[PDB]
Swiss-Prot record:
Protein name, per record: Poly [ADP-ribose] polymerase tankyrase-1
General function of this protein: Poly-ADP-ribosyltransferase involved in various processes such as Wnt signaling pathway, telomere length and vesicle trafficking. Acts as an activator of the Wnt signaling pathway by mediating poly-ADP-ribosylation (PARsylation) of AXIN1 and AXIN2, 2 key components of the beta-catenin destruction complex: poly-ADP-ribosylated target proteins are recognized by RNF146, which mediates their ubiquitination and subsequent degradation. Also mediates PARsylation of BLZF1 and CASC3, followed by recruitment of RNF146 and subsequent ubiquitination.
Source organism superkingdom: Eukaryota
Subunit structure of this chain's protein: Oligomerizes and associates with TNKS2. Interacts with the cytoplasmic domain of LNPEP/Otase in SLC2A4/GLUT4-vesicles. Binds to the N-terminus of telomeric TERF1 via the ANK repeats. Found in a complex with POT1; TERF1 and TINF2. Interacts with AXIN1. Interacts with AXIN2. Interacts with BLZF1 and CASC3. Interacts with NUMA1.
Family under the similarity heading: Belongs to the ARTD/PARP family.
Tissue-specificity statement: Ubiquitous; highest levels in testis.
Organism: Homo sapiens
Lineage: Eukaryota, Metazoa, Chordata, Craniata, Vertebrata
């Protein structure tokens, strides 16, 4: 799922996190279960980035 995940990242303006998501093989299904502690674990060190992603999945899969 690098198709919807890079489109998702681009939508949040977090295109630079692509390499992490590819390396760690993170799909949107994987991401949907990840909170702050899990994203810290894969190298997303900025609170604001993790916040953007977490809220980003909520909008995407709850609307």
């Amino acid at each position: 799922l690098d198709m919807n995940i890079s489109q998702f990242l681009k939508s949040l303006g977090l295109e630079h996190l692509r390499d992490i998501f590819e390396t760690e093989q993170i799909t949107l299904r994987v991401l949907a279960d990840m909170g702050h502690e899990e994203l810290k674990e894969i190298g997303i060190n900025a609170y604001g980035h993790r916040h953007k992603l977490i809220k980003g999945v909520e909008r995407l899969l709850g609307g």
